[PDB]
Design a binder for these strands. Structure first.
Lengths: 56, 49
DNA sequence: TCAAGTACTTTTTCCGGTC
RNA sequence: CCAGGA
DNA sequence: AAGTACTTGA
């Protein structure tokens, strides 16, 4: 569909970052993180992207 | 008054089992909610819904 | 071209411990 | 997961 | 355990 789903959009260029309510941290005690798997996996994507970006 | 029926009566070895009503009974009406889904928590233990 | 093989998919009622 | 209940 | 979907040899 020319408005809502062009085939060019099945390929990702600009990746949406979901907000904390989707990937909350399990904030045990006071000074202890507990970040969601999605928060970790996102950093992996970030890290992978920076390596590639600098590389080229 | 005598019962019109005669009852089969005598000793029988009965066992007390681990399932007692008071450790089972549970009621909730607004309580703790999960963080992610913002829905009622699970189990009697946690005062779940 | 068309049988037979391949990958890969898919489910299964409701209600403590120890980790 | 593991153990159990209807 | 039983399917669709796709691939492979005659």
């Amino acid at each position: 569909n020319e408005v809502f789903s062009r085939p060019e959009w099945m390929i990702l260029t600009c990746l949406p970052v979901p907000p904390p309510p989707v990937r909350p941290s399990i904030s045990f005690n006071e000074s202890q993180r507990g970040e969601d798997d999605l928060t970790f996996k996102l950093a992996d994507i970030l890290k992978a992207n920076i390596s590639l970006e600098t590389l080229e | 008054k005598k019962l019109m029926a005669q009852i089969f009566f005598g000793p029988t070895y009965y066992q007390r089992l681990r399932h007692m009503v008071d450790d089972k009974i549970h009621a909730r009406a607004r309580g703790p909610m999960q963080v992610l889904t913002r829905q009622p928590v699970e189990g009697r233990s946690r005062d779940g819904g």
